[PDB]
Design a protein around this ligand. Structure first.
Ligand SMILES: *[C@@H]1O[C@H](CO)[C@@H](O[C@@H]2O[C@H](CO)[C@@H](O)[C@H](O)[C@H]2NC(C)=O)[C@H](O)[C@H]1NC(C)=O
Ligand SMILES: *[C@@H]1O[C@H](CO)[C@@H](O)[C@H](O)[C@H]1NC(C)=O
Lengths: 90, 461
Protein backbone atom coordinates (compact mmCIF):
# COMPACT_ATOMS: atom_id res chain seq x y z
CA UNK A 1 0.00 0.00 0.00
CA UNK A 2 1.80 3.08 -1.30
CA UNK A 3 1.28 6.63 -0.07
CA UNK A 4 -0.73 8.90 -2.36
CA UNK A 5 1.26 10.01 -5.41
CA UNK A 6 3.72 7.13 -5.16
CA UNK A 7 3.79 4.54 -7.95
CA UNK A 8 6.22 2.09 -6.32
CA UNK A 9 7.26 1.73 -2.69
CA UNK A 10 9.15 -0.54 -0.34
CA UNK A 11 8.38 -1.40 3.25
CA UNK A 12 11.57 0.24 4.52
CA UNK A 13 12.73 2.85 1.97
CA UNK A 14 9.46 4.68 1.38
CA UNK A 15 8.75 5.73 -2.19
CA UNK A 16 10.97 4.34 -4.95
CA UNK A 17 9.25 6.13 -7.83
CA UNK A 18 6.71 8.95 -7.72
CA UNK A 19 3.99 9.93 -10.16
CA UNK A 20 5.80 11.79 -12.97
CA UNK A 21 4.03 15.05 -12.05
CA UNK A 22 5.26 14.89 -8.44
CA UNK A 23 8.78 15.40 -7.05
CA UNK A 24 10.62 12.77 -5.03
CA UNK A 25 12.44 13.84 -1.87
CA UNK A 26 14.83 11.66 0.11
CA UNK A 27 14.68 12.06 3.88
CA UNK A 28 17.39 10.55 6.08
CA UNK A 29 17.15 11.71 9.69
CA UNK A 30 17.52 8.17 10.30
CA UNK A 31 18.91 4.72 9.89
CA UNK A 32 18.44 5.00 6.13
CA UNK A 33 16.84 7.02 3.30
CA UNK A 34 13.06 7.31 3.00
CA UNK A 35 11.55 8.53 -0.24
CA UNK A 36 8.53 10.79 -0.18
CA UNK A 37 6.40 12.42 -2.92
CA UNK A 38 5.69 16.16 -3.18
CA UNK A 39 3.91 18.50 -5.62
CA UNK A 40 6.60 21.09 -4.86
CA UNK A 41 9.75 20.95 -2.75
CA UNK A 42 10.04 22.46 0.75
CA UNK A 43 12.38 25.35 1.57
CA UNK A 44 16.00 24.20 1.75
CA UNK A 45 15.40 22.31 -1.49
CA UNK A 46 14.74 23.32 -5.09
CA UNK A 47 12.34 21.74 -7.64
CA UNK A 48 14.55 19.96 -10.20
CA UNK A 49 12.81 18.80 -13.36
CA UNK A 50 15.46 16.30 -14.45
CA UNK A 51 15.34 13.96 -17.44
CA UNK A 52 15.12 10.78 -15.29
CA UNK A 53 12.36 12.24 -13.02
CA UNK A 54 11.33 15.32 -11.00
CA UNK A 55 13.55 15.61 -7.87
CA UNK A 56 13.82 17.76 -4.73
CA UNK A 57 17.53 18.57 -4.61
CA UNK A 58 19.00 19.84 -1.35
CA UNK A 59 20.53 23.34 -1.16
CA UNK A 60 24.19 22.98 -0.28
CA UNK A 61 25.06 26.68 -0.24
CA UNK A 62 27.02 27.86 2.78
CA UNK A 63 24.69 29.70 5.17
CA UNK A 64 21.64 29.44 2.89
CA UNK A 65 18.07 28.77 4.01
CA UNK A 66 16.34 28.61 0.61
CA UNK A 67 17.68 28.58 -2.92
CA UNK A 68 16.79 29.06 -6.58
CA UNK A 69 19.38 26.57 -7.84
CA UNK A 70 22.51 24.76 -6.68
CA UNK A 71 24.56 27.97 -6.67
CA UNK A 72 22.05 30.75 -6.15
CA UNK A 73 20.48 31.53 -2.76
CA UNK A 74 17.14 33.30 -2.31
CA UNK A 75 17.23 33.53 1.48
CA UNK A 76 20.20 33.43 3.87
CA UNK A 77 20.13 32.27 7.49
CA UNK A 78 19.02 35.05 9.85
CA UNK A 79 21.60 37.79 10.34
CA UNK A 80 23.58 36.97 7.22
CA UNK A 81 24.22 39.25 4.26
CA UNK A 82 22.77 38.22 0.92
CA UNK A 83 24.83 39.29 -2.07
CA UNK A 84 24.29 38.00 -5.61
CA UNK A 85 22.88 34.63 -4.47
CA UNK A 86 25.53 34.03 -1.86
CA UNK A 87 25.52 34.48 1.93
CA UNK A 88 28.24 36.36 3.81
CA UNK A 89 29.25 37.14 7.40
CA UNK A 90 28.94 40.93 7.20
CA UNK B 1 -1.23 25.35 19.48
CA UNK B 2 -2.36 29.02 19.07
CA UNK B 3 -6.14 29.55 18.64
CA UNK B 4 -6.78 30.00 14.94
CA UNK B 5 -9.73 30.34 12.54
CA UNK B 6 -10.62 26.91 11.14
CA UNK B 7 -9.37 25.09 9.10
CA UNK B 8 -6.10 26.99 9.30
CA UNK B 9 -3.27 26.66 11.78
CA UNK B 10 -1.22 29.58 13.09
CA UNK B 11 2.28 29.38 14.58
CA UNK B 12 2.19 32.65 16.47
CA UNK B 13 4.71 35.03 14.87
CA UNK B 14 2.07 35.94 12.23
CA UNK B 15 2.31 32.91 9.90
CA UNK B 16 -0.82 31.10 8.76
CA UNK B 17 -0.89 27.65 7.20
CA UNK B 18 -4.11 26.75 5.39
CA UNK B 19 -2.76 24.42 2.70
CA UNK B 20 -4.44 21.17 1.65
CA UNK B 21 -7.79 22.04 3.15
CA UNK B 22 -10.02 21.99 0.09
CA UNK B 23 -10.66 25.75 0.23
CA UNK B 24 -12.32 27.36 -2.78
CA UNK B 25 -11.86 30.91 -1.50
CA UNK B 26 -9.37 32.88 0.57
CA UNK B 27 -9.98 31.88 4.23
CA UNK B 28 -11.72 34.28 6.59
CA UNK B 29 -11.49 35.04 10.28
CA UNK B 30 -7.72 35.42 10.17
CA UNK B 31 -5.95 38.38 11.78
CA UNK B 32 -5.15 41.31 9.47
CA UNK B 33 -1.74 41.22 11.16
CA UNK B 34 -0.90 38.05 9.24
CA UNK B 35 2.46 38.22 7.49
CA UNK B 36 2.54 34.93 5.62
CA UNK B 37 -0.35 32.95 4.25
CA UNK B 38 0.03 29.47 2.82
CA UNK B 39 -3.07 28.47 0.87
CA UNK B 40 -1.44 26.13 -1.61
CA UNK B 41 -2.91 22.74 -2.55
CA UNK B 42 -6.48 23.93 -2.26
CA UNK B 43 -9.28 24.25 -4.84
CA UNK B 44 -9.29 27.99 -5.55
CA UNK B 45 -10.07 28.28 -9.25
CA UNK B 46 -10.73 32.02 -9.15
CA UNK B 47 -9.49 35.01 -7.18
CA UNK B 48 -12.16 37.75 -7.02
CA UNK B 49 -11.68 41.51 -6.65
CA UNK B 50 -10.22 42.50 -3.28
CA UNK B 51 -9.73 38.86 -2.30
CA UNK B 52 -6.86 39.96 -0.03
CA UNK B 53 -8.50 43.10 1.37
CA UNK B 54 -7.99 42.07 5.00
CA UNK B 55 -4.39 41.02 4.43
CA UNK B 56 -2.67 44.38 3.85
CA UNK B 57 0.55 43.33 5.54
CA UNK B 58 1.19 40.02 3.80
CA UNK B 59 4.84 39.47 2.87
CA UNK B 60 4.55 35.88 1.63
CA UNK B 61 1.61 34.47 -0.33
CA UNK B 62 1.49 30.86 -1.46
CA UNK B 63 -1.05 29.91 -4.11
CA UNK B 64 0.78 26.98 -5.76
CA UNK B 65 -1.33 23.95 -6.71
CA UNK B 66 -4.85 25.42 -6.76
CA UNK B 67 -5.82 25.00 -10.43
CA UNK B 68 -6.17 28.78 -10.38
CA UNK B 69 -7.40 29.87 -13.81
CA UNK B 70 -8.52 33.42 -13.14
CA UNK B 71 -7.07 36.26 -11.10
CA UNK B 72 -9.18 39.42 -11.05
CA UNK B 73 -7.25 42.55 -12.15
CA UNK B 74 -7.68 43.90 -8.60
CA UNK B 75 -7.46 40.70 -6.56
CA UNK B 76 -3.95 41.53 -5.37
CA UNK B 77 -4.88 45.09 -4.49
CA UNK B 78 -3.19 46.59 -1.46
CA UNK B 79 -0.49 43.97 -1.05
CA UNK B 80 2.23 46.63 -0.86
CA UNK B 81 4.50 44.54 1.38
CA UNK B 82 4.34 41.31 -0.62
CA UNK B 83 7.82 39.95 -1.28
CA UNK B 84 7.05 36.39 -2.32
CA UNK B 85 4.22 35.18 -4.52
CA UNK B 86 3.96 31.55 -5.57
CA UNK B 87 1.59 30.52 -8.35
CA UNK B 88 3.19 27.31 -9.70
CA UNK B 89 1.10 24.27 -10.66
CA UNK B 90 -1.99 26.24 -11.66
CA UNK B 91 -3.94 26.89 -14.88
CA UNK B 92 -2.94 30.46 -15.68
CA UNK B 93 -2.38 30.07 -19.47
CA UNK B 94 -1.10 33.64 -19.78
CA UNK B 95 0.94 35.84 -17.41
CA UNK B 96 -1.57 37.75 -15.21
CA UNK B 97 0.09 41.09 -15.94
CA UNK B 98 -2.72 43.36 -14.84
CA UNK B 99 -3.24 41.63 -11.50
CA UNK B 100 0.43 41.77 -10.44
CA UNK B 101 0.93 45.36 -11.61
CA UNK B 102 0.89 46.99 -8.17
CA UNK B 103 3.07 44.49 -6.28
CA UNK B 104 5.90 47.00 -5.99
CA UNK B 105 7.57 45.13 -3.08
CA UNK B 106 7.67 41.75 -4.88
CA UNK B 107 11.06 39.97 -4.97
CA UNK B 108 10.09 36.43 -5.94
CA UNK B 109 7.45 35.43 -8.50
CA UNK B 110 6.85 31.77 -9.34
CA UNK B 111 4.83 31.25 -12.51
CA UNK B 112 6.22 27.89 -13.52
CA UNK B 113 3.96 25.01 -14.59
CA UNK B 114 0.93 27.00 -15.70
CA UNK B 115 0.44 26.12 -19.37
CA UNK B 116 1.47 29.69 -20.21
CA UNK B 117 1.66 30.25 -23.99
CA UNK B 118 1.83 34.03 -24.11
CA UNK B 119 3.10 36.82 -21.91
CA UNK B 120 1.56 40.27 -22.64
CA UNK B 121 3.92 43.07 -23.58
CA UNK B 122 3.17 45.08 -20.42
CA UNK B 123 3.90 42.18 -18.05
CA UNK B 124 6.12 42.94 -15.04
CA UNK B 125 5.76 46.73 -15.24
CA UNK B 126 5.74 48.00 -11.67
CA UNK B 127 7.78 45.06 -10.37
CA UNK B 128 10.58 47.49 -9.43
CA UNK B 129 12.00 45.10 -6.83
CA UNK B 130 11.85 41.75 -8.59
CA UNK B 131 14.89 39.55 -7.88
CA UNK B 132 13.78 36.05 -8.94
CA UNK B 133 11.46 35.03 -11.76
CA UNK B 134 10.41 31.49 -12.65
CA UNK B 135 8.66 30.92 -15.97
CA UNK B 136 9.82 27.37 -16.51
CA UNK B 137 7.73 24.35 -17.54
CA UNK B 138 5.30 26.33 -19.65
CA UNK B 139 4.79 26.68 -23.40
CA UNK B 140 6.57 29.90 -24.31
CA UNK B 141 7.72 29.95 -27.93
CA UNK B 142 10.03 32.93 -27.56
CA UNK B 143 11.88 35.07 -25.04
CA UNK B 144 9.48 37.78 -23.71
CA UNK B 145 11.79 40.67 -24.49
CA UNK B 146 9.80 43.76 -23.69
CA UNK B 147 8.32 42.33 -20.47
CA UNK B 148 11.85 41.47 -19.25
CA UNK B 149 13.06 45.01 -20.00
CA UNK B 150 10.98 46.06 -16.96
CA UNK B 151 13.23 44.20 -14.55
CA UNK B 152 16.68 45.82 -14.15
CA UNK B 153 16.85 44.54 -10.57
CA UNK B 154 16.38 40.92 -11.68
CA UNK B 155 18.99 38.45 -10.40
CA UNK B 156 17.65 34.99 -11.28
CA UNK B 157 15.64 33.97 -14.31
CA UNK B 158 14.55 30.59 -15.61
CA UNK B 159 12.91 30.15 -19.01
CA UNK B 160 13.75 26.44 -18.93
CA UNK B 161 11.43 23.65 -20.12
CA UNK B 162 9.61 25.76 -22.73
CA UNK B 163 9.49 25.79 -26.56
CA UNK B 164 11.90 28.63 -27.30
CA UNK B 165 13.74 27.96 -30.58
CA UNK B 166 15.78 31.10 -31.24
CA UNK B 167 17.04 34.18 -29.41
CA UNK B 168 17.42 37.57 -31.15
CA UNK B 169 19.96 40.36 -30.57
CA UNK B 170 19.54 42.21 -27.25
CA UNK B 171 16.87 39.86 -25.87
CA UNK B 172 18.02 40.48 -22.27
CA UNK B 173 19.72 43.82 -22.68
CA UNK B 174 18.28 45.50 -19.58
CA UNK B 175 18.87 42.68 -17.11
CA UNK B 176 21.99 44.38 -15.70
CA UNK B 177 21.75 42.59 -12.39
CA UNK B 178 21.07 39.15 -13.83
CA UNK B 179 23.32 36.63 -12.12
CA UNK B 180 21.82 33.32 -13.30
CA UNK B 181 19.90 32.51 -16.47
CA UNK B 182 18.34 29.10 -17.18
CA UNK B 183 17.48 28.27 -20.79
CA UNK B 184 17.78 24.52 -20.55
CA UNK B 185 15.30 22.10 -22.18
CA UNK B 186 14.07 24.35 -24.92
CA UNK B 187 14.49 23.85 -28.64
CA UNK B 188 17.03 26.59 -29.15
CA UNK B 189 18.67 26.10 -32.53
CA UNK B 190 19.81 29.69 -33.00
CA UNK B 191 21.48 32.34 -30.83
CA UNK B 192 22.41 35.55 -32.66
CA UNK B 193 25.75 37.37 -32.24
CA UNK B 194 24.40 39.79 -29.63
CA UNK B 195 21.56 37.96 -27.90
CA UNK B 196 23.35 38.21 -24.53
CA UNK B 197 24.63 41.80 -24.75
CA UNK B 198 24.01 43.64 -21.47
CA UNK B 199 24.28 40.65 -19.13
CA UNK B 200 27.54 42.01 -17.68
CA UNK B 201 26.82 40.55 -14.25
CA UNK B 202 25.81 37.08 -15.42
CA UNK B 203 27.68 34.25 -13.64
CA UNK B 204 25.70 31.16 -14.65
CA UNK B 205 24.34 30.36 -18.10
CA UNK B 206 22.52 27.08 -18.55
CA UNK B 207 21.91 26.12 -22.16
CA UNK B 208 21.76 22.32 -21.65
CA UNK B 209 19.31 20.19 -23.70
CA UNK B 210 18.74 22.32 -26.76
CA UNK B 211 19.56 21.97 -30.44
CA UNK B 212 22.57 24.24 -30.84
CA UNK B 213 24.51 23.08 -33.89
CA UNK B 214 27.30 25.63 -33.64
CA UNK B 215 29.18 27.13 -30.71
CA UNK B 216 27.55 30.45 -29.69
CA UNK B 217 29.77 33.50 -30.30
CA UNK B 218 27.26 35.46 -28.18
CA UNK B 219 28.79 34.32 -24.86
CA UNK B 220 31.69 36.64 -25.70
CA UNK B 221 29.51 39.34 -24.12
CA UNK B 222 29.48 37.72 -20.67
CA UNK B 223 32.54 38.99 -18.79
CA UNK B 224 31.27 37.72 -15.42
CA UNK B 225 30.60 34.10 -16.45
CA UNK B 226 31.77 31.47 -13.98
CA UNK B 227 29.61 28.51 -14.91
CA UNK B 228 28.58 27.46 -18.42
CA UNK B 229 26.49 24.48 -19.50
CA UNK B 230 25.77 23.40 -23.07
CA UNK B 231 25.65 19.64 -22.62
CA UNK B 232 23.21 17.59 -24.69
CA UNK B 233 23.21 19.77 -27.74
CA UNK B 234 24.45 19.21 -31.27
CA UNK B 235 27.71 21.15 -31.25
CA UNK B 236 30.55 19.57 -33.24
CA UNK B 237 33.29 22.21 -32.96
CA UNK B 238 34.58 24.33 -30.08
CA UNK B 239 36.67 26.84 -32.02
CA UNK B 240 39.70 28.98 -31.21
CA UNK B 241 38.55 32.04 -29.27
CA UNK B 242 35.37 30.41 -27.95
CA UNK B 243 35.89 31.70 -24.39
CA UNK B 244 37.88 34.90 -24.99
CA UNK B 245 35.01 36.78 -23.39
CA UNK B 246 34.94 34.73 -20.20
CA UNK B 247 38.23 34.83 -18.24
CA UNK B 248 36.43 33.92 -15.06
CA UNK B 249 35.04 30.56 -16.26
CA UNK B 250 35.38 27.91 -13.53
CA UNK B 251 33.07 25.29 -14.97
CA UNK B 252 32.19 24.20 -18.49
CA UNK B 253 29.75 21.37 -19.22
CA UNK B 254 30.23 20.24 -22.81
CA UNK B 255 29.49 16.51 -22.74
CA UNK B 256 26.87 14.69 -24.83
CA UNK B 257 27.71 16.69 -27.89
CA UNK B 258 28.77 15.18 -31.25
CA UNK B 259 31.98 17.01 -30.50
CA UNK B 260 34.62 16.04 -33.01
CA UNK B 261 37.00 18.98 -33.17
CA UNK B 262 38.39 21.59 -30.80
CA UNK B 263 40.62 24.52 -31.72
CA UNK B 264 44.15 24.29 -30.34
CA UNK B 265 43.77 27.46 -28.25
CA UNK B 266 40.09 27.10 -27.35
CA UNK B 267 40.95 26.51 -23.68
CA UNK B 268 43.89 28.82 -23.09
CA UNK B 269 43.64 31.85 -20.76
CA UNK B 270 41.25 30.27 -18.29
CA UNK B 271 43.03 30.76 -15.00
CA UNK B 272 40.04 29.56 -12.93
CA UNK B 273 39.07 26.42 -14.95
CA UNK B 274 39.23 23.46 -12.59
CA UNK B 275 38.41 20.65 -14.95
CA UNK B 276 38.70 19.98 -18.64
CA UNK B 277 37.15 16.75 -19.82
CA UNK B 278 36.82 16.12 -23.54
CA UNK B 279 36.01 12.67 -24.90
CA UNK B 280 35.67 11.57 -28.49
CA UNK B 281 36.96 14.65 -30.29
CA UNK B 282 38.26 12.34 -32.98
CA UNK B 283 39.67 15.03 -35.23
CA UNK B 284 41.98 16.64 -32.66
CA UNK B 285 45.63 16.00 -33.67
CA UNK B 286 47.56 18.26 -31.29
CA UNK B 287 47.53 18.43 -27.49
CA UNK B 288 45.60 21.59 -26.51
CA UNK B 289 47.40 24.82 -25.71
CA UNK B 290 46.85 25.36 -21.98
CA UNK B 291 48.91 28.43 -21.25
CA UNK B 292 47.16 30.59 -18.68
CA UNK B 293 45.05 27.52 -17.82
CA UNK B 294 47.20 25.95 -15.11
CA UNK B 295 44.84 25.17 -12.24
CA UNK B 296 43.18 22.12 -13.73
CA UNK B 297 42.46 19.47 -11.12
CA UNK B 298 41.45 17.01 -13.81
CA UNK B 299 42.51 16.70 -17.42
CA UNK B 300 40.90 14.15 -19.69
CA UNK B 301 41.51 13.94 -23.42
CA UNK B 302 40.22 10.77 -24.99
CA UNK B 303 39.53 9.35 -28.45
CA UNK B 304 41.77 11.73 -30.39
CA UNK B 305 44.67 11.53 -32.84
CA UNK B 306 47.03 13.14 -30.32
CA UNK B 307 50.42 11.39 -30.37
CA UNK B 308 52.52 13.60 -28.13
CA UNK B 309 52.28 15.19 -24.65
CA UNK B 310 54.11 18.50 -24.23
CA UNK B 311 57.07 18.55 -21.81
CA UNK B 312 55.64 21.53 -19.98
CA UNK B 313 52.41 19.80 -18.88
CA UNK B 314 53.93 18.93 -15.53
CA UNK B 315 56.04 22.06 -15.13
CA UNK B 316 52.95 24.22 -15.48
CA UNK B 317 49.94 22.42 -13.99
CA UNK B 318 49.85 23.32 -10.31
CA UNK B 319 47.23 21.06 -8.79
CA UNK B 320 46.67 18.29 -11.32
CA UNK B 321 45.18 15.32 -9.45
CA UNK B 322 43.86 13.16 -12.27
CA UNK B 323 45.16 12.76 -15.81
CA UNK B 324 43.40 10.63 -18.39
CA UNK B 325 44.98 10.53 -21.86
CA UNK B 326 43.69 7.09 -22.76
CA UNK B 327 42.63 5.98 -26.21
CA UNK B 328 44.83 8.26 -28.30
CA UNK B 329 47.95 7.64 -30.38
CA UNK B 330 50.59 8.54 -27.82
CA UNK B 331 53.97 6.88 -28.36
CA UNK B 332 56.57 8.74 -26.27
CA UNK B 333 56.09 9.99 -22.72
CA UNK B 334 57.50 13.20 -21.24
CA UNK B 335 58.52 13.32 -17.59
CA UNK B 336 55.75 13.53 -15.06
CA UNK B 337 58.13 14.94 -12.47
CA UNK B 338 56.55 18.17 -11.30
CA UNK B 339 53.04 16.73 -11.08
CA UNK B 340 53.30 16.27 -7.31
CA UNK B 341 49.53 16.24 -6.71
CA UNK B 342 48.97 13.65 -9.41
CA UNK B 343 47.04 10.65 -8.08
CA UNK B 344 45.50 8.87 -11.06
CA UNK B 345 47.15 8.44 -14.45
CA UNK B 346 45.38 6.71 -17.30
CA UNK B 347 47.32 5.95 -20.46
CA UNK B 348 45.44 2.88 -21.76
CA UNK B 349 44.99 2.25 -25.43
CA UNK B 350 47.92 4.19 -26.86
CA UNK B 351 51.16 3.15 -28.60
CA UNK B 352 53.64 3.40 -25.72
CA UNK B 353 56.50 0.94 -26.27
CA UNK B 354 58.79 1.65 -23.31
CA UNK B 355 58.90 3.05 -19.79
CA UNK B 356 62.16 4.75 -18.89
CA UNK B 357 63.46 5.30 -15.37
CA UNK B 358 62.58 8.98 -15.24
CA UNK B 359 59.08 8.68 -16.70
CA UNK B 360 57.38 8.44 -13.29
CA UNK B 361 60.00 9.78 -10.85
CA UNK B 362 58.30 12.70 -9.14
CA UNK B 363 54.94 11.04 -8.49
CA UNK B 364 54.64 10.91 -4.70
CA UNK B 365 50.85 10.98 -4.65
CA UNK B 366 50.46 8.38 -7.43
CA UNK B 367 47.90 5.77 -6.40
CA UNK B 368 46.56 4.54 -9.72
CA UNK B 369 48.48 4.03 -12.96
CA UNK B 370 46.87 2.36 -15.98
CA UNK B 371 49.18 1.47 -18.89
CA UNK B 372 47.22 -1.44 -20.28
CA UNK B 373 46.68 -1.97 -24.00
CA UNK B 374 49.88 -0.43 -25.27
CA UNK B 375 52.98 -1.93 -26.94
CA UNK B 376 55.34 -1.87 -23.98
CA UNK B 377 58.23 -4.28 -24.39
CA UNK B 378 60.66 -2.78 -21.87
CA UNK B 379 60.20 -1.25 -18.43
CA UNK B 380 63.32 0.02 -16.72
CA UNK B 381 64.20 -1.92 -13.56
CA UNK B 382 63.95 1.22 -11.40
CA UNK B 383 60.92 2.67 -13.19
CA UNK B 384 58.79 2.59 -10.05
CA UNK B 385 61.52 2.92 -7.42
CA UNK B 386 60.77 6.52 -6.49
CA UNK B 387 57.01 6.07 -6.10
CA UNK B 388 54.72 6.92 -3.23
CA UNK B 389 51.56 5.07 -2.19
CA UNK B 390 51.18 3.23 -5.52
CA UNK B 391 48.15 1.07 -4.97
CA UNK B 392 46.98 -0.03 -8.36
CA UNK B 393 49.10 -0.88 -11.39
CA UNK B 394 47.70 -2.16 -14.67
CA UNK B 395 50.16 -3.13 -17.38
CA UNK B 396 48.00 -5.81 -18.96
CA UNK B 397 47.95 -6.54 -22.72
CA UNK B 398 51.37 -5.19 -23.49
CA UNK B 399 54.52 -6.90 -24.73
CA UNK B 400 56.45 -7.57 -21.52
CA UNK B 401 58.95 -10.41 -21.15
CA UNK B 402 59.86 -9.37 -17.63
CA UNK B 403 58.48 -7.10 -14.95
CA UNK B 404 60.22 -5.02 -12.28
CA UNK B 405 59.31 -5.34 -8.61
CA UNK B 406 61.14 -2.41 -7.04
CA UNK B 407 58.79 0.10 -5.40
CA UNK B 408 55.73 -2.06 -5.90
CA UNK B 409 55.38 -3.90 -2.59
CA UNK B 410 52.49 -1.69 -1.58
CA UNK B 411 50.36 -2.74 -4.54
CA UNK B 412 46.85 -3.96 -3.77
CA UNK B 413 46.08 -4.55 -7.41
CA UNK B 414 48.34 -5.73 -10.23
CA UNK B 415 47.22 -6.67 -13.72
CA UNK B 416 49.69 -8.55 -15.93
CA UNK B 417 47.36 -10.64 -18.07
CA UNK B 418 47.84 -10.47 -21.85
CA UNK B 419 51.62 -10.39 -21.77
CA UNK B 420 51.99 -13.66 -23.60
CA UNK B 421 55.76 -13.80 -23.47
CA UNK B 422 55.86 -12.95 -19.78
CA UNK B 423 57.52 -16.00 -18.29
CA UNK B 424 58.53 -15.02 -14.77
CA UNK B 425 56.31 -15.81 -11.80
CA UNK B 426 55.99 -13.36 -8.92
CA UNK B 427 57.12 -14.13 -5.40
CA UNK B 428 54.49 -13.52 -2.71
CA UNK B 429 57.14 -11.83 -0.54
CA UNK B 430 57.65 -8.92 -2.96
CA UNK B 431 53.89 -8.29 -2.82
CA UNK B 432 52.60 -8.77 0.70
CA UNK B 433 49.74 -6.30 0.17
CA UNK B 434 48.46 -7.92 -3.01
CA UNK B 435 44.76 -8.76 -2.96
CA UNK B 436 43.99 -8.93 -6.66
CA UNK B 437 46.38 -10.24 -9.34
CA UNK B 438 45.99 -11.16 -12.98
CA UNK B 439 48.73 -13.06 -14.83
CA UNK B 440 48.98 -14.56 -18.33
CA UNK B 441 49.29 -18.22 -17.27
CA UNK B 442 47.85 -20.49 -14.61
CA UNK B 443 51.23 -21.64 -13.30
CA UNK B 444 51.90 -18.01 -12.36
CA UNK B 445 49.20 -18.21 -9.64
CA UNK B 446 50.81 -21.17 -7.86
CA UNK B 447 52.57 -18.89 -5.38
CA UNK B 448 49.24 -17.44 -4.37
CA UNK B 449 47.44 -20.83 -4.42
CA UNK B 450 48.57 -24.22 -3.13
CA UNK B 451 50.04 -25.64 -6.34
CA UNK B 452 43.91 -12.75 -2.65
CA UNK B 453 42.25 -13.44 -6.00
CA UNK B 454 44.96 -14.46 -8.47
CA UNK B 455 43.52 -15.23 -11.90
CA UNK B 456 45.03 -16.21 -15.32
CA UNK B 457 41.62 -15.69 -17.00
CA UNK B 458 41.96 -13.34 -19.97
CA UNK B 459 38.54 -12.00 -18.95
CA UNK B 460 37.67 -12.81 -22.57
CA UNK B 461 39.77 -9.84 -23.81
C1 LIG C 1 -12.34 21.13 -6.87
O1 LIG C 1 -12.87 21.37 -8.19
C2 LIG C 1 -14.25 21.13 -8.42
C3 LIG C 1 -14.67 21.45 -9.86
O2 LIG C 1 -15.22 22.74 -9.95
C4 LIG C 1 -15.01 21.89 -7.33
O3 LIG C 1 -16.32 22.33 -7.66
C5 LIG C 1 -16.73 23.33 -6.68
O4 LIG C 1 -17.73 22.84 -5.80
C6 LIG C 1 -17.89 23.62 -4.62
C7 LIG C 1 -19.01 23.03 -3.77
O5 LIG C 1 -20.13 22.78 -4.59
C8 LIG C 1 -18.17 25.09 -4.94
O6 LIG C 1 -18.12 25.84 -3.75
C9 LIG C 1 -17.15 25.63 -5.95
O7 LIG C 1 -17.41 26.99 -6.25
C10 LIG C 1 -17.15 24.72 -7.19
N1 LIG C 1 -16.35 25.27 -8.27
C11 LIG C 1 -16.85 26.21 -9.08
C12 LIG C 1 -15.87 27.20 -9.67
O8 LIG C 1 -18.04 26.31 -9.35
C13 LIG C 1 -14.82 20.95 -6.13
O9 LIG C 1 -15.63 21.22 -5.00
C14 LIG C 1 -13.34 21.00 -5.70
N2 LIG C 1 -12.99 19.84 -4.88
C15 LIG C 1 -12.49 19.96 -3.64
C16 LIG C 1 -11.33 19.07 -3.29
O10 LIG C 1 -12.94 20.75 -2.80
C1 LIG D 1 17.04 49.15 -21.55
O1 LIG D 1 18.23 49.32 -22.31
C2 LIG D 1 18.07 49.61 -23.69
C3 LIG D 1 19.43 49.83 -24.35
O2 LIG D 1 20.18 50.78 -23.63
C4 LIG D 1 17.17 50.84 -23.85
O3 LIG D 1 17.09 51.20 -25.21
C5 LIG D 1 15.80 50.52 -23.26
O4 LIG D 1 14.89 51.60 -23.42
C6 LIG D 1 15.95 50.20 -21.78
N1 LIG D 1 14.69 49.74 -21.22
C7 LIG D 1 14.27 50.17 -20.03
C8 LIG D 1 12.84 49.91 -19.68
O5 LIG D 1 15.02 50.75 -19.24
Amino acid sequence: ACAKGCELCSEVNGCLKCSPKLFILLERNDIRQVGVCLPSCPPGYFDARNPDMNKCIKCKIEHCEACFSHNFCTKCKEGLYLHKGRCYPA
Amino acid sequence: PPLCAAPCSCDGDRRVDCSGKGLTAVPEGLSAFTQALDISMNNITQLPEDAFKNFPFLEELQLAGNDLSFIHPKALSGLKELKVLTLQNNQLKTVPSEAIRGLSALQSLRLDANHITSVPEDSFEGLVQLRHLWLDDNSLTEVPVHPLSNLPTLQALTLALNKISSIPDFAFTNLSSLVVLHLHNNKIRSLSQHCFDGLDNLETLDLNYNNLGEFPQAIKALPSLKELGFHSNSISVIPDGAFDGNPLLRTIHLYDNPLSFVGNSAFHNLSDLHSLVIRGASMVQQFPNLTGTVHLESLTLTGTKISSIPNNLCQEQKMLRTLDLSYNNIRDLPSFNGCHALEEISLQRNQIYQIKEGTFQGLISLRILDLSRNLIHEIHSRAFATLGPITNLDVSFNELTSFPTEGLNGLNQLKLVGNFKLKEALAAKDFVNLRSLSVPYAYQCCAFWGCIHCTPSTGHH
